[PDB]
From a paper:
Here, we describe the functional characterization and the three-dimensional structure of CbpL from S. pneumoniae. Taken together, these results indicate that CbpL is a CBP non-covently attached to the phosphorylcholine of pneumococcal teichoic acids. Our studies indicated that CbpL plays a critical role both in pneumococcal lung infections and in transmigration from nasopharynx to the lungs and blood, therefore pointing to a direct role of CbpL in host-pathogen interactions.
The crystal structure presents three residues of the N-term linker (Thr92-Ser94), the CBM that is composed of nine choline-binding repeats (residues Gly95-Glu270), and three more residues from the C-term linker (Val271-Ala273). CbpLCBM is folded in a left-handed superhelical arrangement of the choline-binding repeats, each of them comprising a β-hairpin followed by a loop and a coiled region that is linked to the next repeat, as previously reported in other CBPs15161726. The crystal structure of CbpLCBM:choline complex shows that eight choline-binding sites are available.
Author numbering: 92 to 273
């Protein structure tokens, strides 16, 4: 009898302790498919974990990693319809329900930049609205409030050439409240 990992007819198989092929199951970091062949460079849906996994070229599952537009979490599970923090890039991302990362787009009160990174404590220009927005320290857009000498209106858009904040302050066309006091 045989136990452990065995390569046969071009594929890797895993023999369990009773010398039998493991099929439709994990063995360590590796997944054995319906015919017993080790998954490699491919996506697998595990019905028991209710999640997609990506097996890399060496057979081991991807974790804390991108595969194309898709993110595998620390437990290997593909992210779906959720926020994740990638500690290696020090960046938040939003993975849509289809799995692919959001980019150049709002998600709730948050904005994902062109490479998917959530904006945070920074100004962004929304090409579709043709207006500046300010994302606060937690990512959520500022509204009905000042950021420095600029005012974000109730929909978050930067004010220009108008009276703002209870009609008390005038911002010029450049958006700046020009401070001239006695
Ligand atoms: C990564 N998924 C398998 C979930 C989609 C592939 O297009
Ligand atoms: C390590 N295994 C033998 C499981 C596969 C080699 O890629
Ligand atoms: C753009 N990301 C790096 C965030 C994923 C692409 O693989
Ligand atoms: C093997 N799983 C990927 C299912 C869990 C991580 O240990
Ligand atoms: C609000 N602006 C983007 C115009 C300037 C601040 O960076
Ligand atoms: C709440 N988000 C996850 C969207 C950003 C972290 O503050
Ligand atoms: C002085 N600012 C106008 C910038 C803030 C007023 O609250
Ligand atoms: C989320 N936006 C800033 C795009 C609109 C909120 O009113």
């Amino acid at each position: 009898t045989t136990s452990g990992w065995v390569k046969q007819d071009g594929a890797w198989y895993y023999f369990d302790g009773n010398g039998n092929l493991v099929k439709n199951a994990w063995q360590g970091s590796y997944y054995l498919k319906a015919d017993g062949k080790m998954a490699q460079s491919e996506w697998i849906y595990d019905s028991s974990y209710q999640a997609w996994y990506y097996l890399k070229s060496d057979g081991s599952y991807a974790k804390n990693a991108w595969q194309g537009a898709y993110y595998l979490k620390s437990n290997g599970k593909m992210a779906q319809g959720e926020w994740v923090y990638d500690s290696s890039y020090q960046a938040w991302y939003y993975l849509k329900s289809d799995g692919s990362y959001a980019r150049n787009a709002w998600q709730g009160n948050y904005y994902l930049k062109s490479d998917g990174k959530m904006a945070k404590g920074e100004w962004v220009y929304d090409a579709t609205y043709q207006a500046w927005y300010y994302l606060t320290s937690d990512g959520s857009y500022a509204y009905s409030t000042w950021q420095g000498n600029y005012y974000l209106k109730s929909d978050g858009k930067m004010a220009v050439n108008e009276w703002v904040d209870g009609g008390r302050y005038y911002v010029g066309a450049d958006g700046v409240w020009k401070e001239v006091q006695a």
